[PDB]
C-alpha cells in the first residue's frame, strides 16, 4: 500500500487513538461514533491508555466510561482499551495522537523500539510543543520526523466536556497531505463537532501553543482590574506578536488562519474558560508574594500552567535573535512572570508617545 | 491652499468637533489635549453641540464639563462650545464628525445651505451607516460625497468612559489620503489612546457597523445558555460573514484589518460590555412574548439597539442578491429577530452533516 486508497481497496481503514485524559476520552466518543457510522472505517477503534487506576483499561472495556477523566459520559462500546502500544499501533491505518507533550517523546521513543505501516497517516490533537535544544518544535512536525509518516494537526475552540456533552463545537484540521485531509475530516466531523480543513499545520499548531501566553496576559489584565478597552488592546497585541513569532521563527504565518476555529475562536474560548486566566490573574495580584508553583497547586488542582512554560521558550527564541524590541508584550510578560518586574510595566509598555508608521 | 501643508505655512491648523454625546465629549478631551500640546494645531478647539439643556453650550463653556453625557469628567478649557454650525465650521481645517447617523443627514444638509474650506480634511468617528435607497452607505464615504472633502474614519476598541478616564485604549484611523493620516494621527494619539493608521476606510467602517450583529448573536448565545465552544463558533462565523459582506457588497475586505483595534478587539469589547448583548439575550429568552422596542426601553434606558437595525439592512442586501445560502448566520439571526423563528434554529443552522471543502 502506497496510499490510503490502496489500503481502502482491501477493506476499511483501522483507526487507533493514543492517549488517556478528558480530551482523549471525549475524542474517542467522536471517533467511535464515526467509526461505527462510516463504511470506510473499521468499527473497532483501538485506544492506547496509560496504565492508571480498579484498573483503567478494564473500566473502559467493561463499564464503557472513563470514570477518572471523563466521569459520567458514556463512551461508545466499539472503543477498545489496551495498556500496551503494540496492540494498538500494529495494522493501524490512522493514528490519532492525543498524548500530552510532557509524555510525547517517551511514547514516540517506545514506538521506535511494534510496526507502523508505511501507508499509515497520523494526526496530532495535543495543543503545545516539544523542546529540542532550547528550540520550539511543533508536535505534528516532531511526530512526522521521529516516526516517518505524514502528520496532520487538529485544533479548535474545544473544551473536552462541551464536545463530550454534544454541544456545538468546531475544529480546524491542518495538513500538508491533501489525501489525508479528506479522510481525517470524516473521522472527526459530527453535527456537534464541525471540521474545516487547511493546507498547512504551522499556523494551526502555533495558535494552540501560543494562545496560552494570550490567556496569561488576559489573566494579568483581570488581576490588575483593567477595563475591557485595555484588555482587548493587550489581546490584540498578543495576537499580532503570535503572528510575528510564526513568521520570524517558522518562516510563515497565514493571518487568515485566525479566522479558523483554532485561531481567534479558541483564543476567546481559552480566556473565557478554564482556571488558567484565573491562575495568572491571582499571580499578578500576589506580585512576588506567591510563586507560580504555589498557584498551580492552589488553583489548577496540581496541574502545570501551559502559558508560563510557552512564554519561557517563546521569549528565549526572541531573546537569542535580539528581537525583544519587536515583541514588547511577550517581553514585558516574561519580565513580570519570571524577572520580578512590576505589573504596572504591562501598561507602561504601550502607554507612551511612540507614534506608529 | 491646496493641501494641509499649504495651510500650515500661514499658521496652525484649526480643529473643529461636530457632535454632543458621551463619546464626542470624551474625544473633545483627547483632541483638546493635543490641540494645546501640539504646535501644529491651534489651541482653541471649537465644538458644535445640539441645543440641549440650564443650557448645554453654557455649561461646557463655563463649568468645562458635559454634565449630561460625560458627568464628572473635567473637559479641557480650550474646548469652546457653540450652538450653531457656522461658528464652528468656518475657517476650520480639520472637521471631526461625531454625529449619530440618526442625525447625520440633517447636519450635512444644513451645512450645504457656512463655508467649508477647499483644503479642509474630515474624519468620521461614528460607528454605523446611512441608508440610501435601501442600500447601506458608510459614513466617511457619505460625508465625503455630500460635502466635497476627503473623509477619513476612526474606530477602535473604545468605550467613551474608559477613554475619558485615561485608561489604555487604542484606535484605528482609516484613510485613502496619506497626507491626512499623518495629521489625524497627531490630533488623536495620546499615551492612553494609541493610534494605528491604515490606507482604506471600508474595512474600518464595516467593522464598526456590523460588529453589532455579532454582539446581537453573542446575546442570543448568552440567552440560550450556550457553552463558550458554541458562542465562539457563532462569533467566528459572524466575523467571516462580516468579511464576506464587505467583499461582496463593497468590492473588497482586507482580513488583516481584523488584527487592528477596530476589528477583532472592538468585537470582543463590544460583547463583553454595554447592555446591547444583554438586550439581545433577553429578547431570545422572551421569544415572541416581548418586542425589541419593549426591551430597548426596559434595558437600554430608551435607546435604540444598533444591532437589530444593522441586521435588517445587511440581510436586505443579501436577500436581494439571493445570497442567503452564503450568509447562514446573518440569515437565521434575521429570521429569529424579525420573522418569529425558533431560537433553536440558530444551532440547527450549523449542527448538520454538511461537509466543508
From TrEMBL, chains A, B:
Signal peptide: none annotated. The active site is at 211 (proton acceptor). It comes from the Eukaryota. Residues 14-179 form the Glycerol-3-phosphate dehydrogenase NAD-dependent N-terminal domain. One of its GO terms (cellular component) is glycerol-3-phosphate dehydrogenase (FAD) complex. One of its GO terms (molecular function) is NAD binding. It is an enzyme of class 1 (oxidoreductase). Substrate binds at residues 127, 275-276. Its EC number is 1.1.1.8. It holds the Pfam family NAD_Gly3P_dh_C. Residues 202-347 form the Glycerol-3-phosphate dehydrogenase NAD-dependent C-terminal domain. It catalyses: sn-glycerol 3-phosphate + NAD(+) = dihydroxyacetone phosphate + NADH + H(+). NAD(+) binds at residues 160, 275, 304, 306. NCBIfam families: glycerol3P_DH (TIGR03376). This is Glycerol-3-phosphate dehydrogenase [NAD(+)].
Amino acid at each position: 500500500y502506497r496510499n490510503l486508497f490502496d489500503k481502502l481497496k482491501d477493506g476499511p481503514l483501522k483507526i487507533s487513538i493514543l492517549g488517556s485524559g478528558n480530551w482523549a476520552s471525549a475524542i474517542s466518543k467522536v471517533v467511535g461514533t464515526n467509526a461505527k457510522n462510516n463504511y470506510l472505517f473499521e468499527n473497532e477503534v483501538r485506544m492506547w491508555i496509560r496504565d492508571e487506576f480498579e484498573r483503567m483499561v478494564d473500566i473502559i472495556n467493561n463499564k464503557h466510561e472513563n470514570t477518572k477523566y471523563l466521569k459520567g459520559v458514556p463512551l461508545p462500546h466499539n472503543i477498545v482499551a489496551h495498556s500496551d502500544l503494540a496492540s494498538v499501533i500494529n495494522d493501524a491505518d490512522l493514528l490519532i495522537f492525543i498524548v500530552p507533550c510532557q509524555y510525547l517523546e517517551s511514547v514516540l521513543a517506545s514506538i521506535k523500539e511494534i510496526k507502523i505501516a508505511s501507508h499509515a497517516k497520523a494526526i496530532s490533537l495535543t495543543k503545545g510543543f516539544i523542546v529540542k535544544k532550547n528550540q520550539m518544535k511543533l508536535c505534528s512536525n516532531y511526530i512526522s520526523d521521529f516516526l516517518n509518516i505524514p502528520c496532520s494537526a487538529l485544533s479548535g475552540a474545544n473544551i473536552a466536556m462541551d464536545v463530550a456533552m454534544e454541544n456545538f463545537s468546531e475544529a480546524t484540521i491542518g495538513g500538508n497531505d491533501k489525501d489525508s485531509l479528506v479522510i481525517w475530516q470524516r473521522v472527526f466531523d459530527l453535527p456537534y463537532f464541525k471540521i474545516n480543513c487547511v493546507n498547512e499545520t504551522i499556523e494551526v499548531e502555533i495558535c494552540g501553543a501560543l494562545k496560552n501566553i494570550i490567556t496569561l496576559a488576559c489573566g494579568f489584565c483581570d488581576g490588575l482590574n483593567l477595563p475591557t478597552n485595555s484588555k482587548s488592546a493587550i489581546i490584540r497585541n498578543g495576537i499580532n506578536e503570535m503572528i510575528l513569532f510564526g513568521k520570524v521563527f517558522f518562516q510563515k504565518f497565514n493571518e487568515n488562519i485566525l479566522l479558523e476555529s483554532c485561531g481567534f475562536a479558541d483564543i476567546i474560548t481559552s480566556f473565557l474558560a478554564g482556571r488558567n486566566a484565573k491562575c495568572s490573574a491571582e499571580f499578578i495580584k500576589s506580585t512576588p508574594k506567591k510563586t507560580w508553583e504555589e498557584l498551580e497547586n492552589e488553583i489548577l488542582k496540581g496541574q502545570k500552567l501551559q502559558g508560563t512554560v510557552t512564554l519561557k521558550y517563546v521569549y528565549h527564541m526572541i531573546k537569542e535573535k535580539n528581537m525583544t524590541n519587536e515583541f514588547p508584550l511577550f517581553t514585558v510578560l516574561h519580565k513580570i512572570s519570571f524577572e520580578n518586574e512590576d505589573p504596572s510595566s504591562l501598561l507602561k509598555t504601550f502607554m507612551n508617545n511612540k507614534i506608529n508608521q
